Amino acid sequence: TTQLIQQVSLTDFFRPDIEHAGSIVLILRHPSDMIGEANTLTQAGRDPDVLLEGLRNLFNACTAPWTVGEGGGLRAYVTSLSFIAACRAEEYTDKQAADANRTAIVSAYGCSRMETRLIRFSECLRAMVQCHVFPHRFISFFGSLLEYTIQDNLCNITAVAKGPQEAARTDKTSTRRVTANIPACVFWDVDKDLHLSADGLKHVFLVFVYTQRRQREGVRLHLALSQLNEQCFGRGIGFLLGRIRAENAAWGTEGTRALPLVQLSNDPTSPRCSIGEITGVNWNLARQRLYQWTGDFRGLPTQLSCMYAAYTLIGTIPSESVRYTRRMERFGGYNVPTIWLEGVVWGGTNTWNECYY
Amino acid sequence: PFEIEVLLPGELSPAETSALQKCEGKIITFSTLRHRASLVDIALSSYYINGAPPDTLSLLEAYRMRFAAVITRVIPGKLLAHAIGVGTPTPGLFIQNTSPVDLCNGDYICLLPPVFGSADSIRLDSVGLEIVFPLTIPQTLMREIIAKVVARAVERTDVICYNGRRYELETNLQHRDGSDAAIRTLVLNLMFSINEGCLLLLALIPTLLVQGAHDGYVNLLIQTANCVRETGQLINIPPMPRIQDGHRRFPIYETISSWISTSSRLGDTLGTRAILRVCVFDGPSTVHPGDRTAVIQV
Amino acid sequence: PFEIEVLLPGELSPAETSALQKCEGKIITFSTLRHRASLVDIALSSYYINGAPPDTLSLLEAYRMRFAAVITRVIPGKLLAHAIGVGTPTPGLFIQNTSPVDLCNGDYICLLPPVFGSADSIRLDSVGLEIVFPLTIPQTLMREIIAKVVARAVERTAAGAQILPHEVLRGADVICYNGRRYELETNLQHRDGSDAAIRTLVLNLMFSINEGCLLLLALIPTLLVRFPIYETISSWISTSSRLGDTLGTRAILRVCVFDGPSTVHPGDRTAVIQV
Amino acid sequence: ELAYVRDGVIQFEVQQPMIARDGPHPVDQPVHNYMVKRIHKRSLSAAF
How far is CA A217 from CA A91, A98, A248, A251, A301, in A? Predict the structure, then answer.
C-alpha cells in the first residue's frame, strides 16, 4: 500500500543515527546550478558573486572539499528539517524552543566543526535570497525516515514516498510502527489564528517566508497544518503576513508622462497614420512625431521582487478532530519539545505556489 | 475510497423521496468534511452570507472554499455520497449532465452557479429548505462566461455562441461587497505583468502591422485586438534605452516568463478550477443533457 | 489492470521490426481508450489538424485532451501497452529517458513537444507512417525551457525588424542541471524550427502580452507621474485565460528508484511510480 | 530471536598464582581479575 525510496549520501547535513524515526528529510539540488541561475537572474546593480563567496566557504568547511564540480553521485544529497530549524533558530518566535534545538543539534553532532558549518549555511541562505535565487526550487521533500544503515560518514537510508504513515514495518525498533515527529519551533497552525472551527480533514503545507532589505534578509521554514482549501491558503496567509508584504513592496528594489490613448481615439481630428505609409517605403517622415510620450519604465517592483512566501501541499489527515501531542523527550543527550502527528497520508506533487502580493 | 453519509430527515413525504431518488449522480458541496453530516449544510440556507440568499459572485467564492462531493445510490433512509477534492481512489465514478450544452470525450469539467434560467432544484416544504445543484460546463465555455460577467461588473460600478447555438445569461449583482473584490484581484494581475521588457515588445507594433498584411492570418489576430490596432497608428514609442548590465543579463526573459505564471493564476482566481475529466469506456462519444457519463478524477 | 494492445501490421520489413524492438519504454498517446487499437491512432497522421501537419501550439493542446500510455513489451507479431489513466495499478512501470537532460530521484515527470533539436522517431516507409515520441523533462526545468525558447525567437524578429541590431549580449544561452550544461542553438544560421513550429506560438504570446501592459496604461494614466472599452476587457480575459490553460504544468509520473543508480542519463531506463 | 537481542553481553574471570619469597622485598598478596565483553551485530543479504 506504500512505496519506499533509497539513496546514499554524505552525512554532513543529516545523521540517521540521532534523528528520530519518522522525522522529515529533504534533499538538495546540485549547487553548481545556483551560480548558473544567479548570474542570469540577479537584479541589476547588485553584485552576482556574493553567493559564490558564501557558497565556496560552505564546502571549504565540509569533508571531501575536492569533490565539487563533477557530481558523480557522492555529494550531500539529503538533509533534515531540524537542521534548517537550528540554522535559522534566531528568527522563530518561540525563543527557548529554537535555542534548545540549536544546542541539541550542536552537541549531538560532532560539535567540533559544527558551529562553523551552521554559520556558513546561515549566510549561504542569506546570499541565496540576495539575487532572487529563492531556496524554494532547490529544496525538495522526502517522506519520513523508515530505515537506515551507516558504516562511517556515509549512510544508506530509505523513507516512505506516499501513503499511510503506520502502514510500514520498521522491524528493528521496539514496535514496528512510527509516527511523524517535528520540532515545536516550525509548527504553526493558521486556523487558530484565523479563528475558525478545527474539525474534519486538514492539509499540510511548507512555507518559505522571505524578507528583502539592504544587507538584512531572512528566511524561515514553517510546517503549516490547516483545513483551508488548496488555493485559498494563499489568500489566508496574506492576512497574517500583511506587514512583510508591504515592507518588501517598498524595500525590494534599490538598484515618464502618460498618454491619452482613449481620449484621442474617442475624438476625431487627430494625426492619422493610415497603413499606406507603414507599407515600408519612407517610414520615418510618416511617423515623425505622431506623438512623443517621452515614456520609459525601468525601475519598478516586479512580481518577483515582492514575493514573500511559497507553499506546497504535502499531505492530509482524514481522521477528523486531530489530537496532535506535544512533549519533551531526549534527543541524543538533550531534551527538545517535539510534536507528534499520527495517521498522516503523504502524497501530492511537488508544485510551489508563490504568494507575491 | 472515502464516502460521506447524509442522514435524510424523517417523516418525509413520499413524493419528495421519489424526487430525491431522481438525483442519482449530481454534485453537492460541504463546508467541513465529515463522515456523518446533516441536511442543513447541503441546503441553500447554508450559503447565506449576512442574512440573505447569496449572490453569483458570492457563490463563486463559496465554491472554492467548500469541499466537493458526488451523490451516489440513495436508499430511503440514508443518502450516500463520495468525496472528490482530497486524493482518494474511486472506481467507476459518474456524473449526470446538468448544463444545457453537450459534452464529449476528453473535456475538463468546471463548476459555476446557475446563470441561465431559474435553476431546477428540489424543494422541501415540510423540512422548510431547498437544495440547489451546481452547474457543470466544459473549460472553454467556462472562460467565456467569466469574461462577460466580470466585464458587466465593471459596467455597473449578453450572448454566447456554442456549437452554432446562442444563449443568454441573467447575471445577478444585487450585492456590492463581492463585486469590488473582483476588481481588486483583476488589476493586481495586470499590475504584476509590467516589467522592463514591455518597451521592446511595445516597439514591435509597426513590424507586426506590416506582418499583418500578406500573411492572411495575423489579420484575425489584429481584428479581435483593439488596443494594439489603435496605438499602432497613433503613438511614436521613443526608440530605445540601454541595459544596466547587458553583459550578463537577459531582460526579455523575465517578462516572457513573469507573464506565464500570471496568466495561469488568472483562470483560477477569477472563477473556479478544473475538477474532473470525462472519459467513458464503451459508451457514446457525445452525451446529451440529462444522461450520465463515467468521469475520471483530475 | 487496464492494458491496450496495438496490433502489429503484417509484411513488415525486419529492419523496421528491430527498430521497434528498441523503443521498449516509450510513451504513446491514445485518443480514445480501447483494448484493441490500430497504428493510425499512433502515427503522426492522427495528430495533424486542418490537413497541415500539427503545430507546437497545437501539439500542446493535443497532449491535454489526448490520453497517454506506455509501451511495456514488443512481440514479433504483437505490441502491448499500459495506460497511465484512471486507476490502473501497473506493476513494474519503467520508462526510457528521451530528453538530453539527466534525471535524478524524487523528480516528477512532465511532457513536452520536441523543441531543442530534430525529433528522433521510427519511420515505417512500407506502411507509410511514422510515430513521434514525446519528450520527458523534469518539472522545475519545464517552465524555464519554454520561456527561453520563445524569448529566443522574438530576438530574431527584433534583429530583422530593427534597422540595426542591438547585438551586444552575454554570449550563448545554456540550461544547467546537475552540473551539466546544454548550450542550446550555438549558431545563428540553421533556422530549422525558428518559424516552423513555434511561429504561431510566438504570435499569440506577442499579442496577449502587448495587450497586458497596454490596457492598464490606457485605463489608469496615474501610474506614471466610438470606443467599446469593455469588449476589449472581456476579450483579453478570455484569451489570457485560455493561453494559461495551454501552457500548464501538470506532473504525470514520479521517478522512484530503489536499489538502483540515482542519477540517470539520456538513454537509460528507470522504474517510475504512478503519481 | 536474534531480532530482539538489544545489546547482549558476556564476562570472564581469572585468578593468578603467587610465590612465597622473603628478604628485602615486600610481601605478595593474591590478585583476581574481572573482564567483560559485548556482542556485535552484522547481517547478510541476497537478491532474487
Answer: 11, 19, 11, 11, 17
- The answer to whether C139 and C104 are in contact (CB under 8 A) is no
As a residue count, chain D comes to 48
| Closest by CA position to A210, among listed A139, A123, A130, A313 | A130
Size of chain A, expressed as the number of residues it contains: 357
Which ranges in chain B belong to alpha helices (H)?
Answer: 14-22, 39-42, 56-65, 139-156, 179-191, 198-203, 205-212, 218-224, 227-231, 251-269
Q: Is A318 on the interface with C (CB under 8 A)?
A: no
Distances (CA, A) of A38 to A137, B249, C101, C120: 13, 10, 20, 33
Give the technique used to solve this structure.
Answer: cryo-EM
Give the one of A27, A262, A297 whose C-beta lies nearest to C229's C-beta: A262
Instruction: With CB atoms and an 8 Å threshold, state whether B206 touches A298.
Output: no
Query: In chain C, which residue ranges form alpha helices assigned H by DSSP?
Result: 14-22, 56-65, 142-161, 199-215, 231-246
Please tell me what DSSP assigns to residue A89: T
3 state SS of C260: coil
Distance from CA of C6 to the nearest CA of A (A): 31
Amino acid sitting at position A4:
L
Please answer whether residues C262 and C104 qualify as being in contact, where contact means their C-beta atoms are separated by less than 8 angstroms.
yes
The partner residues of B277 in beta bridges, in order of sequence, read: B108, B296
C-alpha cell at B134: 451546481
Q: Does A291 touch chain B (CB under 8 A)?
A: yes
Q: Rounded to 10 degrees, what is the CA torsion of B142, B148, B149, B154? A: 150
DSSP B138: B
- List, as one string, the DSSP characters of B171-205: -----STTHHHHHHHHHHHHHTT--TTHHHHHH-H
- Between chain A and chain C, how many beta carbons pairs sit less than 8 Å apart? 84
For testing the chain B interface, which of A51, A201, A306 should be mutated: the one with the most B CBs within 10 Å?
Answer: A201
- The answer to whether A105 touches A121, Cβ cutoff 8 Å, is no
Question: Is residue C235 helix, strand or coil?
Answer: helix
Which alpha helices (H) appear in chain A, and where do they start and end? 32-41, 50-60, 81-87, 95-108, 115-128, 191-194, 232-240, 242-251, 261-266, 275-278
